[PDB]
Design an enzyme around this catalytic site. Structure first.
Site, PDB file in Angstrom:
ATOM      1  N   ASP B 217     122.721 -15.866   2.771  1.00  0.00           N
ATOM      2  CA  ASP B 217     122.489 -17.304   2.676  1.00  0.00           C
ATOM      3  C   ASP B 217     123.426 -18.087   3.585  1.00  0.00           C
ATOM      4  OD1 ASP B 217     124.671 -16.641   0.977  1.00  0.00           O
ATOM      5  OD2 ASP B 217     124.356 -18.460  -0.211  1.00  0.00           O
ATOM      6  N   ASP B 241     113.881  -9.986   8.214  1.00  0.00           N
ATOM      7  CA  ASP B 241     112.664 -10.770   8.311  1.00  0.00           C
ATOM      8  C   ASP B 241     113.039 -12.253   8.250  1.00  0.00           C
ATOM      9  OD1 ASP B 241     110.272  -9.092   8.452  1.00  0.00           O
ATOM     10  OD2 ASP B 241     109.367 -10.708   7.247  1.00  0.00           O
TER      11      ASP B 241
END
Lengths: 344, 344
Positions: B217, B241
């Site tokens: 994050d 991804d």
């Protein structure tokens, strides 16, 4: 309007006092019945009860109708056993109240588009609410281990889990611009397909709310290329984490974002920023987050949506007229709370 | 310079031909001994061999020194059994050559900063290479199911898996700006801890390379607020991804980015974009991805780094002078390839 205040440490009390100042005013000049008492919490509580989330605080949150928490953490405890590190008290607090939804708002205030890393045209209008699953997902599932040759973690979700958080997402939408985006990875993971299925099943109850689905990585893209087209974003644990942190950089700087943790217990509202123990007590910390966290509580814990919208605007106004140091200004904590007060 | 061309379906053949036009020119003018034959692949191969990745294609890539693939997918097969869907052929191709590293570049070309959603100042200088694990993670692990009450998926990684991708990451760095950023979620997941451990262990061998670690994050944030400070970014499957799609919007649009799949077999280079069956044949598709893919193959499968850097520039040039429809222009596929040709 009974509220449990857990100032915590670092700039915790600093930023919390300001929100209180703004709150006492708002209440005094509106008759709100706001009643409150400060409770020991985090590293603070540790220095007097041995534990970061003492017994009187646990009771203080229980009997309270909402919680206005500041910040926890600091070097004075960064070397204590986990079970009692201040960080853990946040988890015990969350758990004690069954807080399963973490509302993480990210809005670019009008006039503050140049504070964002996105071109002023994209940053303009941004006002999204990322609702993230708090007690499930790959974060807690079993099994999960390590070895010399491999490691493993498990992302599992249960229909009751996904239902109540999605439920929180649709109710919140009803009060915003009535649009939700369930994020997932259904195109390549069973949980994703399971998260989709359930949310769609729960959306049927909220026909007045538009449900749109999107893949986690695709959504990462639209969060940077078209944030304004999003209102409420509901999603799982780890993804909520990634999408929330992503949206958090959209509006200028991180010390401007509030936070809330909704669940079955006493809601908890708090600034996302850290404790910054170094600048603690130097009056230089920006109280925008804490104050906006105070708004959040007014709207979400008491429904005072108008009043909350008021505070929000006043902040936006103050951030412009008397901007804090982090916003390229020089309005210390004390000073900035005065200006916010004005718009009240 | 033997190459195996798998045009695939949709705008697959379209964008591939362009790259080959650029390729044949680059070769003719510089004597490269480029030799190639096109092979049936994906939905196309399915309508002639019943399987997406037929036998002569398998042999075609095997004897090949590199693969230049286009796109796969379409409605014509969206309803066929998984073991035979065009998508699966990609997985068979990837496995057949033990490809475990997806090189997804994201660079904002000088002068194209205004094409990015990020302020000209942050989009300036951006040149990151996101290396993502291709054959592991939560994408494939077991168990993994669904039920009325719950679903589950398993993220598991093996020392050998993480070692070879990280290996790829460090060698690539050696040739770029010598800096790597292993991304994971070690602070909350066993796998993250495991990922970190291994990468740290593998970095020792590459002391001349700077290894910096980051959480998934947190990384999402710096990829929007400080992209430029990043060179090579190695990471897991799902996270690769998410971070690769993120970095893909930094330079403008998605139909602009190439892709690579490194491993122990014939490397495969392809455009990240989809098959866009609808726009297929209508000469409206932007071959920038396909041609960039062809540059990646030149540097990464032949070491012709200068020639590759040449093509890259010409494309940057043509995306300015004769921009495609997606870039707010109207230089159809055939037109655009001509201008690119010029800079060759």
């Amino acid at each position: 309007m009974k509220v449990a205040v857990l100032p915590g440490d670092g700039i915790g009390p600093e930023v919390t006092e300001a929100a209180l100042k703004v709150l006492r005013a708002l209440d005094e000049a509106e008759g709100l019945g706001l009643a409150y008492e400060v409770f020991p919490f985090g590293g603070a509580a540790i220095d007097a009860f041995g534990e970061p989330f003492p017994e009187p605080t646990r009771k203080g949150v229980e009997e309270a109708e909402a919680v206005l928490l500041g910040s926890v953490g600091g070097p004075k405890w960064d070397g204590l056993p986990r079970k009692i590190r201040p960080e853990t008290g946040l988890l015990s607090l969350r758990k004690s109240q069954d807080l399963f939804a973490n509302l993480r708002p990210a809005k670019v205030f009008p006039g503050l588009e140049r504070l964002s890393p996105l071109k002023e045209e994209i940053a303009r209008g941004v006002d999204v609410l990322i609702v993230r699953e708090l007690t499930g997902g790959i974060y807690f599932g079993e099994p999960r281990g390590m070895s010399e040759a491999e490691a493993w973690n498990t992302e599992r979700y249960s229909k009751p889990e996904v239902e109540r958080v999605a439920r929180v997402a649709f109710e919140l939408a009803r009060k915003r611009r009535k649009h939700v985006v369930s994020v997932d990875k259904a195109n390549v993971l069973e949980v994703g397909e399971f998260w989709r299925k359930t949310v769609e099943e729960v959306g049927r109850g909220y026909p007045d709310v538009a449900l749109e689905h999107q893949y986690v990585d695709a959504m990462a893209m639209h969060l940077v290329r078209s944030p304004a087209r999003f209102d409420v974003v509901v999603t799982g644990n780890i993804f909520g984490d990634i999408l929330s942190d992503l949206a958090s950089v959209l509006p200028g700087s991180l010390g401007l974002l509030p936070s809330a943790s909704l669940g079955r217990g006493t809601p908890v509202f708090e600034p996302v920023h850290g404790s910054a123990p170094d600048i603690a007590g130097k009056g230089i910390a920006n109280p925008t987050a804490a104050i906006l966290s105070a708004a959040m509580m007014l709207e979400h814990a008491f429904g005072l949506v108008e009043l909350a919208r008021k505070v929000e605007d006043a902040v936006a106004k103050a951030l412009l007229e008397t901007p804090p140091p982090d916003l390229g200004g020089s309005a210390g904590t004390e000073a900035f709370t005065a200006t916010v007060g004005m718009g009240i």
